[PDB]
């Protein structure tokens, strides 16, 4: 590879091939924050890697998730393989940069911006010559390297699916981040907009062009003695019985402004003063009802 070639011109200047120092590891308390910073990536990843491993066991290999600096966030897969890798210093919070351990998939994928496999004496350091490592980098909402998925196994055992396996998982985890956080945002913009309606003076109730309940706020819930949850999507006319004023206004699609009106909720009568508004659309006409608090 041209890629491996450059890796070596970088490594060669500053490090030899026969030497090996236990790679730097982040100490306990500060690994705490390192892990915490990636709740979201790690919890996507470990669901993904448990499943991978579930349908791969038995086999001798290890699965890593690393962050953008090649820190090992978590590891799973074959116990004995993990320990053999451990026996070379590969641990939770171990740093796997090229400068630390020479030319390897673990650092090289992130360096080059795409899935990369290194094996055997492609590795700069001799200590890794009977390994194969595959790793694929993942990016964030913006476009920033945010972590790696790697697979490690004794070199004689690498298969042609190993690389694409890490890329497939890198894609799941990567794409779930981006779209999970698009969800998050649009979910926050809901609570926000809901709390707005939670905060009116008026009770507000909306409903379908099929007469189903769409929205109701605490206020309107109390006034009409409905229970907010158990009310949703249920037909309004089976929810409460409606004044001829409403009926005719609904039927006639016609707004009512501050009209007085009497509702019946599961036997009880409620006097209210209401404005009613058609919400015209292709699917049909929805409604808001405002229950003004005298």
């Amino acid at each position: 590879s041209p890629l491996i070639a450059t890796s070596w011109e970088r490594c060669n200047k500053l490090m030899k091939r026969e030497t090996w120092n236990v790679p730097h590891q982040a100490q306990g308390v500060t690994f705490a924050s390192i892990y915490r910073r990636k709740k979201a990536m790690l919890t996507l990843g470990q669901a993904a890697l448990e499943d991978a491993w579930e349908y791969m066991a038995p086999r001798e290999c290890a699965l890593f998730i690393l962050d953008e600096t090649a820190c090992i966030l978590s590891r799973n897969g074959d116990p004995q393989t993990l320990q053999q890798l451990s026996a070379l210093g590969f641990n939770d919070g171990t740093y796997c940069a090229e400068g630390i351990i020479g030319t390897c998939a673990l650092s090289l994928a992130a360096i080059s911006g795409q899935a990369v496999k290194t094996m055997a004496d492609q590795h700069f350091k001799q200590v890794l010559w009977n390994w194969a490592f595959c790793a694929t980098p993942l990016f964030d909402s913006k476009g920033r390297l945010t972590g790696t998925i790697a697979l490690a196994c004794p070199v004689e055992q690498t298969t042609a699916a190993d690389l694409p396996l890490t890329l497939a998982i890198a894609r799941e985890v990567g794409n779930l981040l981006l779209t999970d956080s698009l969800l998050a945002e649009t979910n926050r913009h809901l609570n926000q907009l809901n709390a707005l309606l939670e905060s009116m003076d008026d009770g507000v109730i909306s409903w379908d062009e099929q007469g189903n309940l769409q929205f109701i706020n605490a206020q309107a819930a109390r006034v009409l003695r409905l229970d907010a949850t158990a009310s949703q999507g249920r037909a309004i006319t089976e929810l409460l019985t409606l004044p001829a004023v409403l009926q005719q206004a609904i039927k006639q699609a016609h707004p009512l402004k501050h009209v007085e009106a009497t509702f019946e909720s599961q036997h009880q009568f409620i006097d209210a003063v209401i404005t009613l508004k058609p919400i015209i659309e292709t699917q049909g006409t929805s409604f808001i009802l405002l229950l003004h608090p005298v």
Partner: protein, 356 residues
Amino acid sequence: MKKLINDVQDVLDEQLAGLAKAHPSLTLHQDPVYVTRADAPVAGKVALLSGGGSGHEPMHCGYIGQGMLSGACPGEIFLSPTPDKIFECAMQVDGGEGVLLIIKNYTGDILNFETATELLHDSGVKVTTVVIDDDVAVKDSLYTAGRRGVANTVLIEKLVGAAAERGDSLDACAELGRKLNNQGHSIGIALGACTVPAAGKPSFTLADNEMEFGVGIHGEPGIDRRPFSSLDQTVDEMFDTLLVNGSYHRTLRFWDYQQGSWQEEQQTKQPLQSGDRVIALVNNLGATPLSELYGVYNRLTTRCQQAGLTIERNLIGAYCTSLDMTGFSITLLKVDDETLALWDAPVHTPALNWGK
């Protein structure tokens, strides 16, 4: 082999213990390693932080004290430190007035310091970044996307060092060094490669009377190799480059602590022109006789004059080195009056030490 070293894996520890014992005004932390002012946290002023690979001494630890850096993070020889080290050191020095990360433009440094910035912040430290890219010689290099961060770091460290000391806010500090970065210009040459002790062999090799023109401080290739004709051709064609390549457009990236994201910012360098005032730093890369630096300085002034640049201040010596390389770099930092005021301000660090 000419290395005053014991075991190749202890060299750094040995040397740090020596810097500790020699400087009781400094504190050596272990597990992990980092270096701070023996008097930090200093309640009250913007903490100033830098680091990068060992092998450039006195940069950066030789610049730890009043008037300059609050602490440093050394990594292996020519290897940026891992963000855990930057993080803890930055927490060791937190003034309660923000932390300024001065970051040299290299792949591993940008990446590690950038991540440490985000760690600090998720821990509720105000923090921002100045990024240094002065080396006019190459765009993208062995270890750098864009222009490399060399000796002008030391000037900027000290000018921003002094604004911190004064009292200036995190923001003025960061704006200061960001302005400075667009004003300093630098180009280095090497007549002999450095050797990193772990590799055991020279990081490169030249032929007789051949030099690497526009070398970098981790022994990265220059513009080319070329016969070394004389000190005068050499200083002349270094100086022409600082002119010819002064003009440059790039995108740098600073951390917006208010928005909690990387605001990307485009900006241009202006080549030095007639009537500009400059600070000049003729800098030994590691093994040039101090004697020879003055000869360069001599030729340097003859050029600043015919080009119409008026040198107000200078530093000569080993400020930003590359182990045992034989060469020198020149830095010209375009200045105004408030700049000089900050230059003349006091400074008390193992390697710069003037003022009241």
